[PDB]
Amino acid sequence: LVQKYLENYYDLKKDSGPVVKKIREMQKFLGLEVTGKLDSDTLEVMRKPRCGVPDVGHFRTFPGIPKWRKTHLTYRIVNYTPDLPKDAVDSAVEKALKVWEEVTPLTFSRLYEGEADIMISFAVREHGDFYPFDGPGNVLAHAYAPGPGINGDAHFDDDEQWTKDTTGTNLFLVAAHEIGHSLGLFHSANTEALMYPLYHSLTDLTRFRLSQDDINGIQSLYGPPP
Amino acid sequence: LVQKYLENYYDLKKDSGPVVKKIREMQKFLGLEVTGKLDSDTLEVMRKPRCGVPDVGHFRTFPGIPKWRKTHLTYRIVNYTPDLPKDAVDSAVEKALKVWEEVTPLTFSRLYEGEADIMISFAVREHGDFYPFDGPGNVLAHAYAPGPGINGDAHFDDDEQWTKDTTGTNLFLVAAHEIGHSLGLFHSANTEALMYPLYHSLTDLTRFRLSQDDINGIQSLYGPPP
Ligand SMILES: [Ca+2]
Ligand SMILES: [Ca+2]
Ligand SMILES: [Ca+2]
Ligand SMILES: [Ca+2]
Ligand SMILES: [Zn+2]
Ligand SMILES: [Zn+2]
Ligand SMILES: [Zn+2]
Ligand SMILES: [Zn+2]
Structure with missing residues (x-):
């Protein structure tokens, strides 16, 4: 172990x-x-659910590039999880992207077909990449750093019980964290940072906000909002 | 089909x-x-053995970069095929790299541990990437365009009968073609070009040489030898 x-x-x-x-x-x-x-x-x-991305670095197989060379990105939701109604997943993902739009000059437009910059999908166990999921618990999802093709994409382990509230694994929270990697962020050692590797089953989702560490990290790459 | x-x-x-x-x-x-x-x-x-890389383009999942930003590359043979003795595979790969060194200012140094630029390996069926092999015949191998991580790597389908001569599937010939993709080349429509997608079971390996098309293609990226 x-x-x-x-x-x-x-x-x-x-x-x-x-x-x-x-x-x-x-x-x-x-x-x-x-x-x-x-x-x-x-x-x-070590038994606590966390993000699959390493703590001392990036995924070695697909390093990507430090940051996007453009501020206008596109995203696409490839498939859905049956745990939630399609509109709930859409909202969760939109609110997750909004968190980052707020503190940067970045914009996100949704595509319903074609090759988008950030592709979001649900998968279980072996899913085509070198990092297979592991059933319920442990690794919740993983995302790749900026770049073409698979880079920028976010994968969510569909063996988890994804929820709208905190009765299972909050899709919004995890998606917000994973999008962070999609934009170029690494894990943070700060316990109150969204980029902390372990899932924080927080009580009040309304009291949710990026910590200054998250903001400083993302703004050091793309700058502040104009 | x-x-x-x-x-x-x-x-x-x-x-x-x-x-x-x-x-x-x-x-x-x-x-x-x-x-x-x-x-x-x-x-x-369509029933003839060929390279797994598409004819109208590049692998969409790992586009990579147009060419290496350095002329001194490293390679590493990750595992071997039991069909041949270790020294025969080593020779086949070395002679394949030599073909490209001859017409460019590129050099290749072998690493026996660590992360090299071009990693060569044998695999069967699903092997971690999005393009699983298909048993004997058809797709012989595939390689990725230049870049970090998985880019530049060459995979060989171990369900083929790899040979030193032409009694099966010549490792040298296929490796030479795949290295071509590893350096940034696409498939060519010329039947006598090494970069042609279909495997040419040629009679005399001594009469082997890059066609002018192969040379022109590789030299348009890295230039001629000094
Ligand atoms: Ca992408
Ligand atoms: Ca899991
Ligand atoms: Ca590589
Ligand atoms: Ca095959
Ligand atoms: Zn993470
Ligand atoms: Zn994945
Ligand atoms: Zn090919
Ligand atoms: Zn492969």
């Missing part, structure tokens, strides 16, 4: 000393106590 | 008039008679 967790999220030698060092890097990043041992608190954090 | 053949190699509408037009585009490109009907000669060409 801990081995592959460090392999997948902290690029630990794919082929003890090195492990304790990685355990510590993980503890520093996830806001735990920097000991180096598999504490009760540490083994617990 | 003909439907998916045009879908996969001539990006025919994924969702008759349009088909006859594509049948004709295919006939023009593959050196057949531009009729528009499923002739005996046409149905035959």
Whole structure:
């Protein structure tokens, strides 16, 4: 468990000393106590649902480019999850994009056919890319950094119970985080940041907002709104 | 058969008039008679072993970049095919790279560990990317255009009987063609060009050489040797 967790999220030698060092890097990043041992608190954090994108970097197979070379992006919802009515998914995705439009000069237009910049889809287990999903729990979704083709796309594990509220896995929250990667953001070590790797089942969705860290990160790439 | 053949190699509408037009585009490109009907000669060409990369373009999922932004590239042989002894595969790949080094200012250094520019591997059926192999015959291999991560990589269908001579599928010939895509080349309509999509089971491997078309194509991207 801990081995592959460090392999997948902290690029630990794919082929003890090195492990304790990685355990510590993980503890520093996830806001735990920097000991180096598999504490009760540490083994617990590793069972919590999170984003599939690594913490110390980007997906090696599709690095992409640092940021979009244009401010007017297009998106398209390829398929839907049966857990929710089509209009609820559409709203969730639109509100997620709106969060980023607000703090940048970026715009998003929806396409219903063709090749859009950001393609959103639901999949389970093996879905064509090198990172298969893992059933309910653990990895919730993953997204790729800016670029052509598959880059910029966001995949959501359809083995999760996606909800409009917080009775399951909130689609809005996860989509907002994943769109962040689609625009060029990495994971943050700040526990109150949307870009934090672990899913925060927060009580009040109305009290939701990007933290200053999220804003600073996205504005350092595209600038502030005009 | 003909439907998916045009879908996969001539990006025919994924969702008759349009088909006859594509049948004709295919006939023009593959050196057949531009009729528009499923002739005996046409149905035959479609059963012949070929490269998995499309004829009217590039792989849409991983477009990559037009050419490498550096002349000194690295390559690595990830795994081997049991059909041949390790040294025979190594030679086949080295001779394939040599063909391109000769007519350009490009150099190739072999890495035995780490992330190289061009990763070569053998796979069967579903292998992690969006284009699964199809058992013996038909698609022999596929490669991606220049770029980071998976781009530049060459995959060989291990369901083929790879040989050192021409008693099966010559690894050297196919590797030389695939490396071509790895460097930025597209398929050519010239029947004597290495970049022609269909495998040419040629009699004398000593009489092998890049045609002027191959040379002109590769030199238009990287220039001639100094
Ligand atoms: Ca994309
Ligand atoms: Ca999961
Ligand atoms: Ca590569
Ligand atoms: Ca095959
Ligand atoms: Zn993430
Ligand atoms: Zn995926
Ligand atoms: Zn080819
Ligand atoms: Zn492949």
